[PDB]
């Protein structure tokens, strides 16, 4: 197709490849310890769960400044490659022992927390403004189809074949994909080798308009404005319930419903497929509520954004309430992430709609801030449930709605929309 679109397919795999090295580990610890298996602790999991959100966290921020300076090509390829090597050679750190296995973890998370960044920093210069919202789309929905798919192959190969085939089928597909970014990808129209000339003008000219402007992110500005730490606030508690999910859905499948491991991978992916067929047709829900009513632009943010942050909350506590049912459970549980749906349009837009042209930094902000909880909520909630504990099960579920409840409450407190009357340049 069109360079572009070609740009866009090819972030979409790479994603694919981001998430997917992300969370095989979460299926393949579940068969990686005991009762070739480990004597590992419940404390020790938490820490391999967790140790890849310190790099990502670190290499956030100053991701996102290199970036800006050298461009998003080859800093994306190197981070996923990084990455894949290193999940390449996961399964010789095991032997090794615990220590290597927690820094491949972070060394992974150094590696691939810069994925984002340089994938914006190429949209920067790709996305026409017209057609900026397709595109990102199709990069981004790459992540959510990656943890959909690979919870269940990694079920099915950790089934089937050892875990550590998991590992070295997901790093030599990285290796295989960094193959093509090498190629097709460039980091600027101009730059490309192949793309027409129409195709270079139409995104030229259509950009035109913004880089004209010549003002777009000159400083670190004064971020004291509390709408800001509101969105940020609101972020985190998103993000404590959703990685609480990530990291442990699989090990709550094989320790409280006792499903077999191709049936776990393959139930685990229900709420996140779920969630993304909620969140796509949720631009649609607020585009048919913009057409009618007369909502100021914060009425539909802080409706949906109390949906998609309440209703999660108060499912999970619903599956705290029937746990060990191997019915209800998972239903609940997928319902509570089908409703986090709407928490795209309630909050994930506001980052943008409270600041254009400062979006690519204040979001990095807000994201570095907001990775605290892939740091702190899988550690503590393992340290939490050590063997069986339905009742400590339920005391982590209820501390992950308690903290979207805050999250909910605070936002709406102070969630505000027009301009923080420092980003209009
Ligand atoms: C609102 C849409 C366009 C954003 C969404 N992006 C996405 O990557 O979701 C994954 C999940 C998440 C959801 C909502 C807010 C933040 C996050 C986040 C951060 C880090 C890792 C995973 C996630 C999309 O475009 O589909």
Redesign the pocket.
């Given at each position: 197709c069109s360079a572009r679109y070609n740009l866009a397919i090819l972030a979409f795999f790479g994603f694919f490849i981001v998430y997917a090295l992300r969370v095989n580990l979460s299926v393949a610890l579940v068969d990686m310890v005991d009762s070739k298996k480990y004597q590992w602790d419940a404390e020790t999991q938490g820490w391999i769960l967790g140790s890849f959100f310190y790099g990502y966290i670190i290499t956030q921020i100053p991701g996102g400044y290199v970036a800006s300076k050298i461009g998003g090509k080859m800093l994306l390829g190197f981070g996923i490659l990084g990455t894949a090597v290193l999940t390449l050679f996961t399964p010789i750190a095991a032997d090794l022992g615990v220590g290597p296995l927690i820094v491949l973890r972070a060394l992974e998370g150094l590696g691939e927390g810069v994925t984002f960044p340089a994938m914006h920093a190429m949209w920067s210069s790709w996305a026409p403004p017209l057609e900026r919202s397709k595109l990102?789309?199709i990069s981004?929905?790459g992540?959510?189809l990656g943890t959909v798919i690979s919870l269940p192959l990694s079920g099915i190969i950790c089934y089937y074949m050892n875990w550590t085939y998991v590992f070295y089928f997901f790093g030599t597909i990285g290796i295989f994909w960094f193959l093509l970014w090498i190629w097709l990808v460039s980091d600027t129209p101009q730059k490309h080798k192949r793309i027409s000339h129409y195709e270079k003008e139409y995104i030229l000219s259509s950009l035109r308009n913004q880089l004209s402007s010549q003002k777009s992110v000159p400083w670190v500005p004064i971020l004291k404005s509390l709408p800001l730490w509101a969105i940020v606030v609101a972020?985190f508690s998103?993000?404590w319930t959703?990685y609480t999910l990530l990291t442990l859905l699989p090990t709550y499948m094989k320790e409280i419903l006792r499903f077999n491991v191709q049936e776990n991978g393959f139930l685990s992916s229900l709420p996140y497929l779920g969630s993304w067929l909620c969140?796509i047709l949720s631009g649609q829900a607020a585009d048919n509520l913009r057409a009618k009513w007369n909502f100021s632009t914060l009425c539909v943010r802080r409706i949906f954004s109390l949906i998609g942050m309440i209703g999660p909350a108060v499912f999970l506590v619903a599956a705290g309430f029937i746990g060990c049912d191997y019915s209800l459970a998972v239903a609940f549980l997928t319902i509570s992430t089908t409703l986090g749906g709407f928490?795209?349009?309630g909050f994930?837009?506001n980052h943008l709609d409270i600041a254009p042209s400062y979006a690519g930094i204040l979001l990095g902000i807000t994201?570095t801030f907001a990775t605290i909880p892939g740091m702190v909520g899988p550690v503590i909630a393992k340290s939490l449930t050590p063997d069986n504990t339905v009742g400590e099960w339920q005391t982590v579920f209820y501390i992950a709605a308690a903290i979207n409840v805050f999250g909910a409450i605070f936002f709406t407190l102070f969630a505000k929309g027009e301009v923080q009357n420092w980003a209009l340049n």
């Open positions: 990102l789309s981004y929905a992540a959510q972020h998103y993000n959703f969140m928490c795209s349009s994930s837009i994201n």
